[PDB]
Design a protein around this ligand. Structure first.
Ligand SMILES: CC(=O)N[C@@H]1[C@@H](O)[C@H](O)[C@@H](CO)O[C@H]1O
Ligand SMILES: *[C@@H]1O[C@H](CO)[C@@H](O)[C@H](O)[C@H]1NC(C)=O
Lengths: 66, 49
């Protein structure tokens, strides 16, 4: 149900977090179309521990590389 | 399977995530459910009880 990157939870804006066993992806409700989990399609809320089902991953933003 | 089985092939989906879909349909973001899942389960159980 979520992604924790820097001690903060991350929820999908419009989609769900889907993994094919090795890499995680966010995709639409009714059509498999994976995309890299950036900061624009995920909104942060929580403390990474209140949520059940947390999985660690990276949600790296485009503002850091440039 | 949520509501998917009413539209075609039944698609399995965990129940804790299904309620996040349904909160998302009444203007309440997903963050309310997951960070309050334990409380909501007790309220629903008592209501059914
Ligand atoms: C099963 C699996 O690992 N699927 C893909 C893999 O083919 C791909 O190389 C990787 C990103 O490089 O994302 C994942
Ligand atoms: C995520 O990383 C933190 C820090 O290393 C660790 O304490 C936590 O157990 C990790 N999450 C999982 C699900 O293992």
């Amino acid at each position: 149900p979520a992604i924790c990157h820097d001690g903060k939870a991350h929820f999908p804006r419009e989609g769900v977090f889907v993994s094919n066993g090795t890499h995680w992806f966010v995709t639409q409700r009714n059509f498999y179309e994976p995309q890299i989990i950036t900061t624009d399609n995920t909104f942060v809320s929580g403390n990474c521990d209140v949520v059940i089902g947390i999985v660690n991953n990276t949600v790296y933003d485009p503002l850091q590389p440039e | 399977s949520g509501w998917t089985f009413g539209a075609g092939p039944a698609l399995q989906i965990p129940f804790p995530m299904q309620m996040a879909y349904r909160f998302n349909g009444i203007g309440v973001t997903q963050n309310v459910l997951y960070e309050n899942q334990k409380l909501i389960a007790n309220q629903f159980n008592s209501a059914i009880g």
